[PDB]
RNA sequence: CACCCCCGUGCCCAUAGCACUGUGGAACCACCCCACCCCAUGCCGAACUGGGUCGUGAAACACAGCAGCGCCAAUGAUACUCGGACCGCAGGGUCCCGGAAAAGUCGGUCAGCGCGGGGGUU
RNA sequence: UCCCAAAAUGUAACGGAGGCGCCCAAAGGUCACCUCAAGACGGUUGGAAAUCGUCUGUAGAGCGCAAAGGUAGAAGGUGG
């Protein structure tokens, strides 16, 4: 051995592939299944007709049109004012 | 066993000293408390008992171990650890034990003289930091363990300390003039 | 001060020596554009406690007051001014500087007197009669004398907006 | 001079002054008219100068403190990462900015305390007096 | 304090429901057994105990429940939903409930 | 929406919030009262809860005044920039052409809009 | 996991920072309920913080670990 610290400290190697954002934009005719938003916390609160996966994800329960409602930030929503 | 003079001496004498638009306004007593902040300096899964059982017999209630604030300061501190003890009193038990004090507690106190004035909780509430439990009508050194103390809280509807002091002593209370 | 043009376009001035301000109140927010040089020699005097003759081209004299001014970095030269059309009984509030006079009994003592807060602002100035200045005592001030708002003599009427106990001038020590 | 504690490194970019007033803290002032990195030591080289010239008063203000750590060549190579967190501390100063502004002493008795100081700065400046009345 | 109602209320989904919600203000002895329709802030039936009580106020418990459930009848509502408030589904209030939970 | 006020419940969800001040009482609401047990507070029927006056309006609430604090927030000029074209060895910078803040200021407000139930216009 | 990365995504470097190779019979499912940090005034061993109390107190706390996003009408804190 010797008498020092295992590996050399203060590095900078590696990071993470990473994703997220928004999958469906205002005006898009969502569908059954489609995903609308992959977010981390509660950036966008599942509005009307919008399910929310375990990972704060947002999917379409039914079919219809994608719509965006943002009340003074803090809480946002995606609803589906369906076409039919 | 009281409450009448309570009003009588307190209430009447109060419009009859003051002048309240109602009797609901006049100052009152919300509750009397007793924290048993033992332990820490004494970690006795034994001592704690000396607290409750006892406290219990004086305040006629079973107190809550106001455990550690999960505070683990530089010294002997930590997460939630049975440190203090609360036994809150209101109405009946409040008065029932309350009386015991205005009557036997302080009246029956060695090296007693009264109680400092000075406005405490500007909130009209009065504070009472009792010590040696040796002066209780329930404390028995000849059937206990060691010997401790305690602090009691005066919760009053008094809006002003002026008004409090009145109610305070009216009801009964010794002051060191 | 005969400011004349007043369009969103300033070409015909951005080269030709002219500043470019706006004066209002709440009624009329007339577009503007005066001359550089003039307001240049002007504001200097009256400062923000000096209302002036505003006969914009055509002839419509207006009374206002230098509210805020925004000058160039790199070049201590000003670029945009905002005039606040004078009122009658109350304007808003005014920015009034602190001044000394008479030698200080601290100065010669060995220290110096510091005017902590240069210009001072006071609640309710009173239009028509607004102090275009403010002289203050300092003599009395020795080694560590602090004067505040609650101290400065007022011009009869004016009410001090800033907090009283705030130190206006303090005769600092040596070194 | 050097800051008390922080992160350790930085970067580099520029564009004209932003929060560099004018009058305040005194009557006379000095102005930086050019992009530079003022070296903390290039300030002492200024303060300590102006000092001498003023037996007393102190009425000298240095409102430019150095919020920045630059690095260096640990001899030469190039096979290693970031280096020399401790080369020296800098105070990026943009045009129009104000590093200096004395107070109390006579004009000329101030039109020198700067002149000199100027002589140890990397940039070209000029002195200023009043009419400065934006926010207060 | 209001938490309790908002916690109850909020958990009570709205349109996703399609159903309706029955309230109650039995905090006082002036219950209001109100019924509302998700979308439009419209109140459908509702059978309090305000139209007198016969001296029963913490008693007309069922009166209003029974009054209520039968109430929506002249409207026809099969699927409703209990949107109580602080009123931790006890007795005086479980009244309206059972009472209505069958009076319909 | 005949006039009003009161309770519940929305939309909206600080220009609709705070504070200071006044108004209201026995229609409503609240405190208050008792509470052995239904059910309940890791102690306390304080809170949950059950059975109810009187008394009060003091507190909680509702209304109303007010703006001193919050929140909102111009216009003007500006920062910056898509595009086009130039300068300085370099740091950096400019002109033409649209876009154009943020902060500050003028000023703005202490909401507005519903559904239903109660009680009044002696 | 942050920054770099040039407001969609994605984008390097022996570029700048920091964690993981688990843990939890429950720190789960569900149903109830409570809500913080902190300072100030007053109060017993206490006396710096901390226990009790009363005001302020959109949270300046929490969330098992690194960070960010997220969150009190709780993902914060208890019990069936």
C69 touches chain D (CB under 8 A): yes
| E20 domain-assigned | yes
Report d(CA D66, CA D2) in Å as an integer.
Answer: 6
Query: Is residue E77 one of the residues assigned to a domain?
Result: yes
The number of distinct structural domains making up chain D is 1
Residue D12 lies in a domain: no
Q: Which two tokens stand for residue E12?
A: 């009570």
Find how far residue C73's CA is from the centre of its chain: 20
Total domains in the fold of chain E: 1
Nucleotides of strand G within 7 Å of the protein's CB atoms: 1-4, 8-11, 14-19, 32-35, 37-38, 41-55, 68-75
CA–CA gap between residue D19 and residue D65 (Å, rounded): 13
Q: Are E18 and E41 in contact (CB under 8 A)?
A: no
Tell me how far the alpha carbon of residue A16 is from its chain's centroid: 17
CA–CA distance, D47 with D64 (Å, rounded to integer): 12
Q: Locate C163 and state its tokens.
A: 């907090």
Q: What is the largest CA-CA distance in chain D?
A: 57
Q: Which residues pair with C159 in a beta bridge?
A: C123
Distance CA D105, CA D125 (A): 20
Q: SS3 for E69-101, per residue? A: HHHHHCCCCCCCCECCCCCCCCCHHHHHHHHHH
Last residue of a domain, one of C86, C104, C136: C86
> Rounded to a whole number, what is the distance in Å from the CA of D66 to chain C's nearest CA?
21
Is residue C49 located within the same domain as residue C120?
A: no
The answer to whether residue D113 sits within a structural domain is yes
How far apart are alpha carbons B162 and B114 in whole angstroms? 19
Domain of C101, in residue numbers: 87-175
Rounded CA-CA distance A46/A54 in Å is 12
Q: Is the CB of B108 under 7 A from strand G?
A: no
Give me the residue label for tokens 């307001």.
Answer: C39
Distance between the alpha carbon (CA) of A46 and the C1' atom of G10, Å: 27
Provide the domain limits for residue E74.
Answer: 11-104
Asked if C74 lies within 8 A of D136 by C-beta distance, the reply is no
D7 within a domain of the structure (yes/no): no
Q: What's the CATH number where D127 sits?
A: 3.90.1170.10
Q: What kind of experiment solved this structure? A: X-ray
What is the residue whose two structure tokens read 């809006």? B159
Cross-strand bridge partners of residue C153: none
C45 CB near a chain D CB, below 8 Å?
Answer: no
Q: Is C175 on the interface with D (CB under 8 A)?
A: yes
CA nearest C114 in D: which residue? D104
d(CA D129, CA E38): 69
Q: Does the CB of B153 fall within 7 Å of any strand G atom?
A: yes
**DSSP notation for D64-121:** T----EE---SSS---SSS--TTSEEB--B-TTEEEE-B-SS-STTTTTHHHHHHTTS
Contact C73 D57 (CB under 8 A): no
SS3 E53: coil
* Residue listed under structure tokens 């439990």: B133
Q: How far apart are CA E104 and CA E95, in angstroms?
A: 14
Cβ separation of C68 and D134 shorter than 8 Å?
yes
- Three-state SS for E11? helix
| A30 within domain boundaries | yes
The CATH number for E84's domain is: 3.30.420.100
Same domain for C82 and C9, yes or no, is yes
Whether the Cβ atoms of residue D68 and residue D10 lie closer than 8 Å to each other: yes
Q: How far is the CA of E30 from the C1' of F2 (A)?
A: 28
- Cβ–Cβ under 8 Å, residues B143 and B136: no
Q: Rounded distance, CA B152 to CA B37, Å?
A: 11
Q: For chain E, first and last CA: distance in Å?
A: 32
Largest CA distance in chain A: 76
| D100 strand-pairing partners | D30
> What is the torsional sign of CA D48, D49, D52, D57?
negative
**Dihedral sign computed on CA atoms, order C90, C96, C101, C106:** positive
In angstroms, the Cα distances linking E77 to E36, E37, E43, E44 are 11, 11, 13, 9
Q: Are the CB atoms for B31 and B89 separated by under 8 Å?
A: yes
Domain end position, chosen among C40, C67, C86: C86
How far is residue D28's CA from residue D127's CA, in Å, rounded to a whole number? 7
Q: Mark which of C59, C86, C113 sits at the end of a domain.
A: C86
Provide the residue ranges of all domains of chain B, joining segments of one domain with +: 1-177
Query: Using CA atoms, how far apart are residues A63 and A33, in angstroms rounded to an integer?
Result: 9
Measure B136 CA to F54 C1' (Å): 39
Distances from the Cα of D96 to the Cαs of C72, C102, D30, D124, in angstroms?
8, 35, 9, 11
- Does the residue E21 lie in any domain? yes
Q: How many helices (H) and strands (E) does chain E have?
A: 3, 3
Query: Using CA atoms, how far apart are residues C5 and C31, in angstroms rounded to an integer?
Result: 8
- Strand segments, DSSP code E, in chain B are 29-35, 126-128, 151-156
- What pairing do the DSSP bridges indicate for beta strands C21-24 and C78-84? parallel
Domain enclosing residue D34, as ranges: 18-136
Is some CB atom of chain C closer than 8 A to the CB atom of D35?
no
Resolution in units of Å: 3.3
Angle subtended at Cα B134 by Cα B132 and Cα B139, rounded to the nearest 5 degrees: 125
CB contact under 8 A, D136 and C95: yes
Of the partner residues C47, C73, C119, the one whose CB lies closest to the CB of residue D17 = C73
Whether the CB-CB separation of C119 and C98 falls below 8 Å is answered with: yes
What's the rounded Cα separation, in Å, for the pair B10 and B172?
Answer: 10
Running DSSP on this structure, what letter comes out for residue C72?
A: P
Rg for chain B (alpha carbons), in Å? 18
Residue A21: name the closest of A70, A54, A57 by CA. A57
- Chain D, nearest residue to C48 by Cα: D133
Cβ neighbours of C83 (radius 10 Å)? 27
When divided into structural domains, chain C yields a total of 2
Cα separation of C164 and C140, whole Å?
19
Contact list, C174 vs chain D (CB under 8 Å): 56-57
- Rounded to 5°, the CA angle E44-E48-E53 comes to 155
Residue E57 domain flag: yes
* Counted domains in chain A: 1
- For residue C79, the SS3 value is strand
Q: Which structural domain range is residue A25 located in?
A: 20-84
Do C123 and C143 fall into the same domain?
yes
Read off the CATH number of the domain in which C11 is found: 2.40.240.10
Topology of domain B1-177 in CATH is 50s Ribosomal Protein L5; Chain: A, (3.30.1440)
Sign (positive/negative) of CA torsion A45, A48, A50, A52? positive
Nucleotides, chain F, CB distance < 7 Å: 7-11, 13-14, 28-32, 34-35, 38-39, 42-46, 48-53, 55-58, 74-80, 91-93, 96, 104-108, 114-119
> Which residue in the set C48, C76, C95 is minimally distant from D128, CB to CB?
C76
Give me the DSSP letters along chain A: --SS-SS-SS----------S-SS-TT----SS-EEE--SSSSSEE-TTEE--TTS-EEESS-S-EEEEEETTTEEEEEE----
**Furthest CA-CA distance within chain B:** 55
């Amino acid at each position: 051995a010797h008498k020092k610290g295992v590996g050399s400290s203060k590095n900078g190697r590696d990071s993470n592939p990473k994703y997220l954002g928004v999958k469906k934009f205002g005006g898009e005719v969502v569908k059954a299944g489609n995903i609308l938003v992959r977010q981390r916390g509660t950036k966008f609160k599942a509005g009307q007709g919008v399910g929310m996966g375990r990972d704060h994800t947002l999917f379409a329960l039914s079919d219809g049109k994608v719509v965006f409602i943002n009340k003074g930030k803090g809480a946002r929503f995606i609803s589906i004012e369906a076409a039919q | 066993q009281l409450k009448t003079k309570y009003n009588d001496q307190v209430r009447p004498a109060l419009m009859q000293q003051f002048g309240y638009s109602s009797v609901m306004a006049v100052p009152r007593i919300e509750k009397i408390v007793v924290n048993e902040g033992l332990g820490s300096s004494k970690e006795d899964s034994k001592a704690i008992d000396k607290a409750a059982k006892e406290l219990a017999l004086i305040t006629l209630q079973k107190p809550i171990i106001t455990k550690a604030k999960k505070s683990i300061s530089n010294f002997k501190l930590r997460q939630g650890m049975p440190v203090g003890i609360k036994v809150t009193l209101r109405g009946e038990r409040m008065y029932v034990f309350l009386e015991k004090l205005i009557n036997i507690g302080l009246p029956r106190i060695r090296d007693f003289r009264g109680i400092n004035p000075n406005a405490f909780d500007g909130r009209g509430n009065y504070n009472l930091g009792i010590k040696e439990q040796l002066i209780f009508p329930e404390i028995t050194y000849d059937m206990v363990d060691k010997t401790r103390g305690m602090d009691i809280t005066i919760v009053t509807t008094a809006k002003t300390d002026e008004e409090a002091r009145a109610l305070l002593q009216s009801m009964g209370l010794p002051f060191r003039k | 001060m005969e400011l004349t043009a007043k369009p969103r376009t300033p070409k015909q001035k951005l080269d030709e020596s002219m500043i470019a301000a706006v004066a209002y109140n709440k009624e009329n927010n007339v577009s503007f554009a005066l001359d550089r040089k003039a307001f240049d020699r002007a504001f200097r005097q009256q400062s923000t406690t000096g209302l002036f003759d505003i006969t914009v081209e055509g002839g419509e004299t207006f009374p206002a007051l230098v509210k805020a001014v925004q000058m160039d970095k790199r070049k201590r030269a000003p670029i945009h001014v905002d005039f606040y059309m004078v009122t009658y009984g109350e304007p808003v509030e005014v920015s009034v500087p602190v001044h000394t006079t008479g030698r200080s009994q601290g100065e010669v003592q060995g220290g110096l007197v510091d005017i902590v807060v240069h210009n001072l602002q006071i609640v309710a100035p009173g239009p028509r009669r607004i102090p275009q200045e403010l002289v203050v005592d300092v003599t009395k001030m020795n080694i560590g004398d602090h004067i505040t708002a609650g101290d400065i003599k007022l011009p009869e009427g004016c009410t001090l907006a800033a907090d009283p106990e705030l130190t206006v001038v303090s005769v600092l020590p040596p070194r | 001079k050097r800051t008390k504690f922080r992160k350790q490194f930085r970067g580099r970019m520029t564009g004209d002054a932003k929060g560099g007033d004018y009058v305040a803290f005194g009557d006379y002032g000095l102005i930086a008219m050019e992009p530079a990195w003022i070296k903390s030591n290039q300030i002492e080289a200024c303060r300590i100068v102006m000092s001498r010239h003023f037996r007393r008063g102190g009425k000298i203000y240095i409102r430019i403190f150095p919020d920045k750590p630059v690095t260096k060549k640990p001899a030469e190579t190039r096979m290693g990462k970031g280096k020399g967190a401790v080369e020296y501390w800098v105070s990026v100063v943009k045009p129009g900015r104000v590093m200096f502004e004395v107070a109390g002493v006579t004009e000329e008795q101030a039109k020198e305390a700067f002149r000199l100081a100027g002589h140890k700065l990397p940039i070209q400046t000029k002195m200023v007096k009043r009419e400065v009345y934006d926010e207060a | 304090r209001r938490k309790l109602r908002t916690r109850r209320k909020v958990r009570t989904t709205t349109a996703a429901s399609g159903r309706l919600r029955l309230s109650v203000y039995r905090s006082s002895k002036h219950i209001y057994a109100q019924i509302i329709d998700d979308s439009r802030g419209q109140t459908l039936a509702a059978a309090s105990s305000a139209a007198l009580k016969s001296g029963n106020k913490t008693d007309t418990a069922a009166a209003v429940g029974k009054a209520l459930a039968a109430a929506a009848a002249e409207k026809g509502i099969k699927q409703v939903v209990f949107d109580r408030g602080s009123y931790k589904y006890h007795g005086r209030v479980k009244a309206l409930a059972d009472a209505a939970r069958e009076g319909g």
